[PDB]
Enzyme design. Structure first.
Site, short mmCIF file in Angstrom:
data_model
loop_
_atom_site.label_atom_id
_atom_site.label_comp_id
_atom_site.label_asym_id
_atom_site.label_seq_id
_atom_site.Cartn_x
_atom_site.Cartn_y
_atom_site.Cartn_z
N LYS C 90 0.84 -1.19 0.00
CA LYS C 90 0.00 0.00 0.00
C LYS C 90 0.87 1.24 0.00
N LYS C 126 5.51 2.61 -2.51
CA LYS C 126 5.41 3.99 -2.96
C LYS C 126 5.83 4.10 -4.41
N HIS C 209 -16.58 7.75 1.38
CA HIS C 209 -16.85 9.05 1.99
C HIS C 209 -15.66 9.52 2.81
N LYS C 387 -14.46 -1.82 1.40
CA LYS C 387 -15.74 -1.54 0.75
C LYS C 387 -15.77 -2.15 -0.65
N1 LIG Z 1 -2.27 12.66 0.45
C1 LIG Z 1 -2.32 11.87 1.52
O1 LIG Z 1 -3.28 11.16 1.76
C2 LIG Z 1 -1.16 11.86 2.47
C3 LIG Z 1 -0.05 12.67 2.23
N2 LIG Z 1 1.00 12.65 3.06
C4 LIG Z 1 2.15 13.52 2.84
O2 LIG Z 1 1.70 14.86 3.08
C5 LIG Z 1 2.47 15.78 2.31
C6 LIG Z 1 1.61 16.73 1.47
O3 LIG Z 1 0.20 16.47 1.40
P1 LIG Z 1 -0.39 16.27 -0.08
O4 LIG Z 1 -1.48 15.23 -0.06
O5 LIG Z 1 0.85 16.01 -0.88
O6 LIG Z 1 -1.03 17.69 -0.54
P2 LIG Z 1 -0.75 18.32 -2.01
O7 LIG Z 1 0.45 17.72 -2.67
O8 LIG Z 1 -2.04 18.42 -2.79
O9 LIG Z 1 -0.32 19.80 -1.59
C7 LIG Z 1 1.03 20.05 -1.24
C8 LIG Z 1 1.12 21.53 -0.91
O10 LIG Z 1 2.42 21.84 -0.42
C9 LIG Z 1 2.93 22.93 -1.19
N3 LIG Z 1 4.41 22.84 -1.21
C10 LIG Z 1 5.21 22.01 -1.90
N4 LIG Z 1 6.51 22.26 -1.60
C11 LIG Z 1 6.54 23.26 -0.69
C12 LIG Z 1 7.56 24.02 0.07
N5 LIG Z 1 8.88 23.77 -0.08
N6 LIG Z 1 7.13 24.98 0.91
C13 LIG Z 1 5.82 25.26 1.08
N7 LIG Z 1 4.85 24.61 0.43
C14 LIG Z 1 5.15 23.63 -0.45
C15 LIG Z 1 2.25 22.86 -2.54
O11 LIG Z 1 2.19 24.14 -3.17
C16 LIG Z 1 0.88 22.37 -2.15
O12 LIG Z 1 0.04 23.46 -1.77
C17 LIG Z 1 3.37 14.91 1.45
O13 LIG Z 1 4.63 14.78 2.13
C18 LIG Z 1 2.72 13.55 1.43
O14 LIG Z 1 3.69 12.52 1.22
C19 LIG Z 1 1.02 11.89 4.16
C20 LIG Z 1 -0.02 11.04 4.49
C21 LIG Z 1 -1.22 10.95 3.68
N1 LIG Z 2 -17.33 -2.52 -10.14
C1 LIG Z 2 -17.22 -1.19 -10.19
O1 LIG Z 2 -16.71 -0.62 -11.12
C2 LIG Z 2 -17.77 -0.42 -9.05
C3 LIG Z 2 -18.24 -1.18 -8.00
N2 LIG Z 2 -18.78 -0.64 -6.92
C4 LIG Z 2 -19.19 -1.58 -5.90
O2 LIG Z 2 -20.28 -1.13 -5.09
C5 LIG Z 2 -19.84 -1.19 -3.73
C6 LIG Z 2 -20.62 -0.22 -2.86
O3 LIG Z 2 -20.63 1.08 -3.44
P1 LIG Z 2 -22.06 1.74 -3.73
O4 LIG Z 2 -23.10 0.74 -3.27
O5 LIG Z 2 -22.08 2.25 -5.15
O6 LIG Z 2 -22.11 3.03 -2.77
P2 LIG Z 2 -23.53 3.78 -2.55
O7 LIG Z 2 -24.62 2.75 -2.39
O8 LIG Z 2 -23.35 4.85 -1.50
O9 LIG Z 2 -23.74 4.46 -3.99
C7 LIG Z 2 -22.88 5.48 -4.50
C8 LIG Z 2 -23.49 5.98 -5.80
O10 LIG Z 2 -23.48 4.98 -6.83
C9 LIG Z 2 -24.72 5.05 -7.54
N3 LIG Z 2 -25.10 3.78 -8.23
C10 LIG Z 2 -25.59 2.67 -7.65
N4 LIG Z 2 -25.84 1.70 -8.56
C11 LIG Z 2 -25.51 2.18 -9.77
C12 LIG Z 2 -25.52 1.69 -11.17
N5 LIG Z 2 -25.95 0.44 -11.47
N6 LIG Z 2 -25.10 2.52 -12.14
C13 LIG Z 2 -24.67 3.77 -11.86
N7 LIG Z 2 -24.63 4.28 -10.62
C14 LIG Z 2 -25.03 3.56 -9.54
C15 LIG Z 2 -25.74 5.47 -6.49
O11 LIG Z 2 -26.84 6.18 -7.07
C16 LIG Z 2 -24.94 6.37 -5.58
O12 LIG Z 2 -25.14 7.73 -5.98
C17 LIG Z 2 -18.35 -0.89 -3.80
O13 LIG Z 2 -17.63 -1.38 -2.68
C18 LIG Z 2 -17.96 -1.66 -5.03
O14 LIG Z 2 -17.69 -3.02 -4.70
C19 LIG Z 2 -18.86 0.69 -6.77
C20 LIG Z 2 -18.42 1.57 -7.77
C21 LIG Z 2 -17.83 1.09 -9.01
N1 LIG Z 3 -12.35 21.01 0.41
C1 LIG Z 3 -13.46 21.06 1.14
N2 LIG Z 3 -14.03 19.89 1.57
C2 LIG Z 3 -15.16 19.92 2.32
C3 LIG Z 3 -15.76 21.12 2.66
N3 LIG Z 3 -16.86 20.84 3.40
C4 LIG Z 3 -16.97 19.50 3.53
N4 LIG Z 3 -15.91 18.93 2.86
C5 LIG Z 3 -15.60 17.50 2.71
O1 LIG Z 3 -16.50 17.00 1.73
C6 LIG Z 3 -17.11 15.80 2.17
C7 LIG Z 3 -18.61 16.04 2.31
O2 LIG Z 3 -18.87 16.74 3.52
P1 LIG Z 3 -20.16 16.46 4.45
O3 LIG Z 3 -21.33 16.10 3.57
O4 LIG Z 3 -20.48 17.69 5.27
O5 LIG Z 3 -19.82 15.20 5.40
P2 LIG Z 3 -18.98 15.29 6.77
O6 LIG Z 3 -18.50 13.91 7.15
O7 LIG Z 3 -19.82 15.89 7.87
O8 LIG Z 3 -17.72 16.24 6.44
P3 LIG Z 3 -16.94 17.09 7.56
O9 LIG Z 3 -17.28 18.55 7.40
O10 LIG Z 3 -15.46 16.92 7.33
O11 LIG Z 3 -17.27 16.62 8.95
C8 LIG Z 3 -16.46 15.44 3.48
O12 LIG Z 3 -15.40 14.56 3.22
C9 LIG Z 3 -15.89 16.74 3.99
O13 LIG Z 3 -14.74 16.54 4.77
C10 LIG Z 3 -15.19 22.31 2.23
O14 LIG Z 3 -15.70 23.39 2.52
N5 LIG Z 3 -14.03 22.27 1.47
N1 LIG Z 4 0.15 8.27 0.37
C1 LIG Z 4 -0.31 8.33 1.75
C2 LIG Z 4 -1.38 7.26 2.00
C3 LIG Z 4 -1.29 6.07 1.08
C4 LIG Z 4 -2.52 5.19 1.16
O1 LIG Z 4 -3.63 5.73 1.37
O2 LIG Z 4 -2.38 3.97 0.98
C5 LIG Z 4 0.83 8.21 2.77
O3 LIG Z 4 1.93 8.73 2.54
O4 LIG Z 4 0.66 7.62 3.84
#
Ligand SMILES: NC(=O)C1=CN([C@@H]2O[C@H](COP(=O)(O)OP(=O)(O)OC[C@H]3O[C@@H](n4cnc5c(N)ncnc54)[C@H](O)[C@@H]3O)[C@@H](O)[C@H]2O)C=CC1
Ligand SMILES: NC(=O)C1=CN([C@@H]2O[C@H](COP(=O)(O)OP(=O)(O)OC[C@H]3O[C@@H](n4cnc5c(N)ncnc54)[C@H](O)[C@@H]3O)[C@@H](O)[C@H]2O)C=CC1
Ligand SMILES: Nc1nc2c(ncn2[C@@H]2O[C@H](COP(=O)(O)OP(=O)(O)OP(=O)(O)O)[C@@H](O)[C@H]2O)c(=O)[nH]1
Ligand SMILES: N[C@@H](CCC(=O)O)C(=O)O
Ligand SMILES: NC(=O)C1=CN([C@@H]2O[C@H](COP(=O)(O)OP(=O)(O)OC[C@H]3O[C@@H](n4cnc5c(N)ncnc54)[C@H](O)[C@@H]3O)[C@@H](O)[C@H]2O)C=CC1
Ligand SMILES: NC(=O)C1=CN([C@@H]2O[C@H](COP(=O)(O)OP(=O)(O)OC[C@H]3O[C@@H](n4cnc5c(N)ncnc54)[C@H](O)[C@@H]3O)[C@@H](O)[C@H]2O)C=CC1
Ligand SMILES: NC(=O)C1=CN([C@@H]2O[C@H](COP(=O)(O)OP(=O)(O)OC[C@H]3O[C@@H](n4cnc5c(N)ncnc54)[C@H](O)[C@@H]3O)[C@@H](O)[C@H]2O)C=CC1
Ligand SMILES: NC(=O)C1=CN([C@@H]2O[C@H](COP(=O)(O)OP(=O)(O)OC[C@H]3O[C@@H](n4cnc5c(N)ncnc54)[C@H](O)[C@@H]3O)[C@@H](O)[C@H]2O)C=CC1
Ligand SMILES: Nc1nc2c(ncn2[C@@H]2O[C@H](COP(=O)(O)OP(=O)(O)OP(=O)(O)O)[C@@H](O)[C@H]2O)c(=O)[nH]1
Ligand SMILES: Nc1nc2c(ncn2[C@@H]2O[C@H](COP(=O)(O)OP(=O)(O)OP(=O)(O)O)[C@@H](O)[C@H]2O)c(=O)[nH]1
Ligand SMILES: N[C@@H](CCC(=O)O)C(=O)O
Ligand SMILES: N[C@@H](CCC(=O)O)C(=O)O
EC number: 1.4.1.3
Lengths: 501, 501, 501
Positions: C90, C126, C209, C387
């Site tokens: 992952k 990664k 979500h 999921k």
């Molecule tokens: N995306 C994820 O789910 C996770 C991300 N991370 C780590 O978090 C960090 C960033 O989060 P992202 O998801 O990548 O957001 P992102 O990549 O969408 O945003 C990164 C932000 O950092 C800014 N940036 C880049 N270099 C910079 C610098 N030298 N100074 C100031 N700002 C700078 C960019 O302009 C951008 O606004 C990374 O190190 C990533 O590996 C860690 C755990 C989970």
């Molecule tokens: N095989 C695939 O490409 C996909 C599979 N799934 C399966 O469904 C599981 C549960 O996710 P959901 O039940 O979708 O979340 P969910 O029940 O919250 O629905 C998310 C959205 O998908 C829409 N949706 C449901 N059936 C649909 C269809 N036959 N055609 C187009 N849109 C539809 C719903 O209206 C809803 O807006 C996932 O874990 C995954 O296994 C979900 C998305 C894509």
């Molecule tokens: N970028 C951004 N994301 C948002 C904003 N508001 C809600 N979200 C995210 O969009 C998704 C939909 O939000 P909600 O329908 O309010 O559900 P929620 O679990 O109560 O989201 P939270 O506000 O984080 O507690 C969630 O993942 C939120 O975290 C926003 O103003 N900006």
């Molecule tokens: N890329 C994120 C999360 C990866 C993932 O969701 O598997 C991290 O640095 O942890």
């Protein structure tokens, strides 16, 4: 092209089959040496014949491409696999707006019988994509070809061991290169035979010498075997040989142009060349090199300086040999009475309706049938496929050995003669003729393609003639070909237990 | 080995490629018969050349083995697949502590161009395991080899249809046997071609006659083709032929020993043999059988009774022909001015830096390049691979038929002559010479390997000479080889549409 | 970003590991219940720990794309799979010109230990593609992503059962949608779990979500667990809770923005926001909605009307909590003495060098480490993967049943009470509270993500605190986390026999 006589293409081919089946049915029953000599013998023979006729698998596709202008468009495609009594299946890919399920099924069955006629171990198949390639950029045609290849691959309709495509109308080297590249780069990445998934490839890509011109070369060999048989030329009231004859060519594509080149080379005179936009005519002869060069330059044959824009049907031009080399169902009940040629050499697939065949028979016109005459394409595709499976160019392992062996052989004759006619017979040099010098190293790829093709067309012509005499078919060569095809395919189904049931 | 001139190995090879690219770029553009004749042609050509240079896939591995003493140790490994314009990929496995990603990538690209030079239909690849085999028991080397094979197989970096390894530095028959056995016993258990997953196998396991000595045999043929060309020997101020020449050999392994055996056999004199611990020297000549027998006994070259322990670089020994057959980057800016041989025959991969190439050019020293000269190894590996795919030993189906056929052929001459010179001439026995009696049954595996190799090395030397003449390259044979390689690989990328994109 | 202190990223992470290894080595040895209690025990523990550190498989790629302008470009890519003690692997995909084999290997190992800390059953991996995404059109980024997916898939570096990517720097929902679509449409066409090949998908394509905001939500929960522990807040000299605190955030991407949203929601005050072009500052507070709306409109943070363009390092802004949420190695020996904040919450991966960690320790600065604090992303990716494997949305089968069940349960209390306090008590309505009425049907997908994440972050924080007290580590939370990670991963290697050697 004719609203009087326009039969369903699949059923028209089934009619040809039915007719050959009628003639052999007795021979099949009598061969069958089962203890049921009860006329469930007759019953199982015509149960098997009903199994052979329909296509086993047909796949129909719709997939989206995004055009160069950004628009989304839905492309329609088809591939039919007619028989699997031999594997893989073999057949070309046609890009044309006339493509349909019935057209593709009809051509797929023609491939089965054609392959049986020339003893090529493939079942029949065919594909079609319903587009006009002239309305698409090169980039768009690549996108369509590559995507079509994966939709076929996902469902088992292309692969070195199931189904090996090839060019047809409006596809060539270029499309085949695209097909082979996306097959080998994705699903075939671990397959040692991935590049044998398609034939008609460019040489740089596993293609074989002479594939582009192969079906034209076979058209020449097919005509030659019959034009040199005095018994058939008597019934026609004509002189054996090429040196004095005229011919016209409907269609100036891969089949039409190369048929013209080889016939011209051996003394025939091309009088007329017909195309999708019009015809040209010159009773003094058209030169294929000049016409090609003009066509490459202007994208058309009209306006060719050394002939005159001919009005009226190319099929009714006055000549000895008519070569329909365009699409199908061009000779019908309508124009058949006006044809004026005495030999019709079908380079194209299914250019003659069954009604037109009847008229030609009454009229002592010899139709050399597609089953036999255009099979040089699939014969050399077969050679390409074998070249791919073998992973060497022909002769590369043996050129030097064979050259050395031949010189030591001739030296064995030399030394044996000097040993006997000793001193005052002198030195007695044994050397190759010019012709043997040129074979001193053994066959190359080019030699195998030329002589292997000539061998196949000749052996197949004799089998057709033998069968036509045996059953008193005269100039109905089509029925004789189907008779040979049916006998071969029937034996396979019979001794296999038919199917998994 | 030299701090002054120690270029990055991968980029050094890219430099060689850039040179050849600059020479042919015009010929590629002209040759290209496309509609956009601007320098957008020149742009497409340079874009393709940039695609060819980098490796497509490189895998880096770490895996644990537990040593004979019970400790755990982490082994590092690498396999690079440079190009897939031909499949499978082909390249050796090197066991050495100098192994690195850059070394492996560099050798992988050399394999691509080398295979193109000798018309062997493989893309290039190479592997390395970063160990010194002298520090491991046989049991540990088997466990490292078998585990390395499984880690490569799991990720698609070995298989008869993707990647076929072979021996290199510190691996041979024995390791290849281990690789083939664990591949065929696990992932390849259902694959009809499982034993074609690797070459250089022992004969008992699908190996081919002469593979061990093949690259030495090719070094002889490569030298011979140039040492017998008076035009090149003029520029050198030398006499054609072997009978009067001296040579020195750096490295007494699989390449070095067998190069010595074949050169000695045809009248050359081995003056010096250098090795990882020291050199030995004798201006009267070193005999290869005695030296090998000594080396097998004592595990070293030094103390050989019939030469004296030479001090100072083996590369600067006085001789006609220097054969570097060890590691890479041995001839540099530093010692190139002191070489005092007139022909440098690279048996090893990349033994000469680009700076050393300049110096050698200025001093009219002929460098026969690795691309061409050591390609006998991969050529006979190719023969072994084909032997595996074909599942018969060469000639086994035809020996009897061919021998009978030849005697009836000679009898046809005999009876024809008696039939004419009646008993007014007696009996006229036609019998094989001694030379033809040896070939009366046709080629065997040995004959194909020997003559197929000779045929390939000659045909390739002639292509290199023709290209050097055509571009006025003089004694820059390396640039001529790359020119040939680039032209061949470029055509494949060009007519394939480059990639599925 | 700092020449003084710029350690190799992979070895820096190995240093962190060595440090935790040093602390637990005794505990591992005495747990080990083997009876060669010799310092073989000693030795196998150290041998296993050396097996755990290096990456098992790293793939390096070069592939061509044709840009929108028509030129060919070579794209470079990397994916490292660090450990397979749990499967699948992952880890995210980073698009950046700073991508490198060592950067990718370093982050892959962080993924292994991070997953062990929060008890997520994945090994670490990664990927990186060396491009700057703003220099490419959307069409180009789609082709790069789709082609990268196929090159990884061909070699076993993506798949629901081996390696499941996710977003990172400069990738999100969009790229993940592309990855999932080409995987499922080609190699995964027959795989029931094809759409579990990647996480971070849009909801319409199997996403879950709150995945986009998940790692920000986890940063809040991680801070909260420690900011509410009076023992740690004493050592810092500050008051438990959020209601009175300031923070600054380096990086306004997916991690930075959502960390700001949740901290702002519970009463903290964002003073400073730093980004790639500059910082902004306001001691009265920045509102995350207004900032995001400004950033969406203008593509930058600078010029935000309600704050002032701050010059000088965002990392040295005066605040309670510093959240580095950009790239790695931002706090070094240089600027560590000028940090001003008491709590450093690493949202980013590896933002603090080991030298900076030493300084922070001496100054009683609490670093909440990346291993723990940003693991909310991978935790909710894990939920998304489950999921996909389950093929239902949470609760859909049970909402109605559970609702009905709860009302009948409350009615059981009601009827039992009425039966007892007959008429002299009347009707006794038992009804849900407002809070329970919201849960009357059981959990939905949103509820599971929120409470499952909170449960994981709390359980992991207490394990880190327990371990830090146990070994008297004070505010060295990073070493406590690695201690927990190492213990868990060691147990798996130990009881598995290590490897199949
Ligand atoms: N995306 C994820 O789910 C996770 C991300 N991370 C780590 O978090 C960090 C960033 O989060 P992202 O998801 O990548 O957001 P992102 O990549 O969408 O945003 C990164 C932000 O950092 C800014 N940036 C880049 N270099 C910079 C610098 N030298 N100074 C100031 N700002 C700078 C960019 O302009 C951008 O606004 C990374 O190190 C990533 O590996 C860690 C755990 C989970
Ligand atoms: N095989 C695939 O490409 C996909 C599979 N799934 C399966 O469904 C599981 C549960 O996710 P959901 O039940 O979708 O979340 P969910 O029940 O919250 O629905 C998310 C959205 O998908 C829409 N949706 C449901 N059936 C649909 C269809 N036959 N055609 C187009 N849109 C539809 C719903 O209206 C809803 O807006 C996932 O874990 C995954 O296994 C979900 C998305 C894509
Ligand atoms: N970028 C951004 N994301 C948002 C904003 N508001 C809600 N979200 C995210 O969009 C998704 C939909 O939000 P909600 O329908 O309010 O559900 P929620 O679990 O109560 O989201 P939270 O506000 O984080 O507690 C969630 O993942 C939120 O975290 C926003 O103003 N900006
Ligand atoms: N890329 C994120 C999360 C990866 C993932 O969701 O598997 C991290 O640095 O942890
Ligand atoms: N491609 C092959 O190797 C083989 C093809 N065939 C058959 O030969 C026929 C044509 O050969 P292709 O290679 O497809 O040539 P092609 O597709 O390269 O060219 C076909 C030519 O026919 C012309 N044409 C179309 N409709 C016409 C009409 N009504 N009148 C006059 N000209 C017309 C087109 O303008 C074009 O010049 C097809 O029926 C094909 O199935 C048969 C055996 C082998
Ligand atoms: N794996 C693949 O993608 C391909 C495989 N092949 C296999 O090779 C076998 C032999 O065909 P050939 O001997 O090539 O016909 P051939 O020897 O006549 O080759 C024709 C062209 O291929 C070129 N060629 C040879 N080796 C090359 C290399 N390593 N790189 C680039 N070009 C090279 C030649 O220089 C010549 O220009 C066939 O049986 C086929 O199976 C052929 C073409 C592509
Ligand atoms: N194995 C093959 O078929 C082919 C090998 N090569 C190249 O030939 C070279 C060596 O041939 P191998 O098969 O590896 O023989 P090998 O590995 O069996 O023997 C190499 C010999 O060179 C000696 N040596 C090592 N380092 C040396 C140094 N710095 N100076 C002098 N001697 C040294 C070793 O002690 C050993 O005796 C390598 O560069 C290899 O890549 C090239 C083409 C084919
Ligand atoms: N399937 C496998 O594991 C192996 C396959 N082969 C295949 O056989 C093909 C032809 O090679 P060969 O005929 O072996 O060359 P060959 O006929 O020159 O024989 C080489 C050696 O194998 C011995 N041999 C032959 N048949 C044997 C058997 N049934 N059991 C034990 N030893 C036997 C012979 O006596 C000879 O010593 C190759 O293409 C190769 O792929 C060769 C070795 C192992
Ligand atoms: N369209 C076209 N094809 C040609 C022409 N000349 C040769 N070819 C084809 O190019 C291929 C190689 O041609 P050659 O090198 O001349 O060898 P060849 O097999 O003796 O050529 P042919 O006998 O004419 O088939 C063969 O398939 C030829 O048919 C030509 O003028 N026009
Ligand atoms: N190491 C070593 N190998 C040898 C020796 N003699 C022959 N070989 C190799 O062992 C194999 C068997 O040799 P032969 O039976 O004579 O067949 P060959 O092809 O005529 O051998 P050569 O002409 O010497 O290459 C061939 O690969 C030889 O190259 C030797 O003295 N020492
Ligand atoms: N498409 C050609 C040839 C097919 C092939 O070469 O396989 C035909 O109609 O016969
Ligand atoms: N490793 C040898 C060739 C190996 C093989 O025969 O494939 C070389 O460097 O060329």
């Amino acid at each position: 092209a004719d609203r009087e006589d326009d039969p369903n293409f699949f059923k028209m081919v089934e009619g040809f089959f039915d007719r050959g089946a009628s003639i052999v049915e007795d021979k099949l029953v009598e061969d069958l040496k089962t203890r049921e000599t009860e006329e469930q013998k007759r019953n199982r023979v015509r149960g098997i014949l009903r199994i052979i006729k329909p296509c086993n698998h047909v796949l129909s596709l719709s997939f989206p491409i995004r055009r160069d202008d950004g628009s989304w468009e839905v492309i329609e495609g088809y591939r039919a696999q007619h028989s699997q009594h031999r594997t893989p299946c073999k057949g070309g890919i046609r890009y044309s707006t006339d493509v349909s399920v019935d057209e593709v099924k009809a051509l797929a069955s023609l491939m089965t019988y054609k392959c049986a006629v020339v003893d090529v171990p493939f079942g029949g198949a065919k594909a079609g994509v319903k587009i006009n390639p002239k309305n698409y950029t090169d980039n768009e045609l690549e996108k369509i070809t590559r995507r079509f290849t994966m939709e076929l691959a996902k469902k088992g309709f292309i692969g070195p061991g199931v189904d090996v495509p090839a060019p047809d109308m409006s596809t060539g080297e270029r499309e085949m290169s695209w097909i082979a590249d996306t097959y080998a780069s994705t699903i075939g990445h671990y397959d040692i035979n991935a590049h044998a998934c398609v034939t008609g490839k460019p040489i740089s890509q596993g293609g074989i010498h002479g594939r582009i011109s192969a079906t034209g070369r076979g058209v020449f060999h097919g005509i030659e075997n019959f034009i040199n048989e005095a018994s058939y030329m008597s019934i026609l009231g004509m002189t054996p040989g090429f040196g004095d004859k005229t011919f016209a060519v409907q269609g100036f594509g891969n089949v039409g142009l190369h048929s013209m080149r080889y016939l011209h080379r051996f003394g025939a005179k091309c009088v007329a060349v017909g195309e999708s936009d019009g015809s040209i005519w010159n009773p003094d002869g058209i030169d294929p090199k000049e016409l090609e060069d003009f066509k490459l330059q202007h994208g058309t044959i009209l306006g060719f300086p050394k002939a005159k824009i001919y009005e009226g049907s190319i099929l009714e031009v006055d000549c000895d040999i008519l070569i329909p080399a365009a699409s199908e169902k061009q000779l019908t009940k309508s124009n058949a009475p006006r044809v004026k040629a005495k030999i019709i050499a079908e380079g194209a697939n299914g250019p003659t309706t069954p009604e037109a065949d009847k008229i030609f028979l009454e009229r002592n016109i010899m139709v050399i049938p597609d089953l036999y005459l255009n099979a040089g394409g699939v014969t050399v595709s077969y050679f390409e496929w074998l070249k791919n499976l073998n992973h060497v160019s022909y002769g590369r392992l043996t050129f030097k050995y064979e050259r050395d062996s031949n010189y030591h052989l001739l030296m064995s004759v030399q030394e044996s003669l000097e040993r006997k006619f000793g001193k005052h017979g002198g030195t007695i040099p044994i050397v190759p003729t010019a012709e043997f010098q040129d074979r001193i190293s053994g066959a190359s790829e080019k030699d195998i393609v030329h002589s292997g093709l000539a061998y196949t067309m000749e052996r197949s012509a004799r089998q057709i003639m033998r069968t036509a005499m045996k059953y008193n078919l005269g100039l109905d060569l089509r029925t004789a070909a189907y008779v040979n095809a049916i006998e071969k395919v029937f034996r396979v189904y019979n001794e296999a237990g038919v199917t998994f049931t």
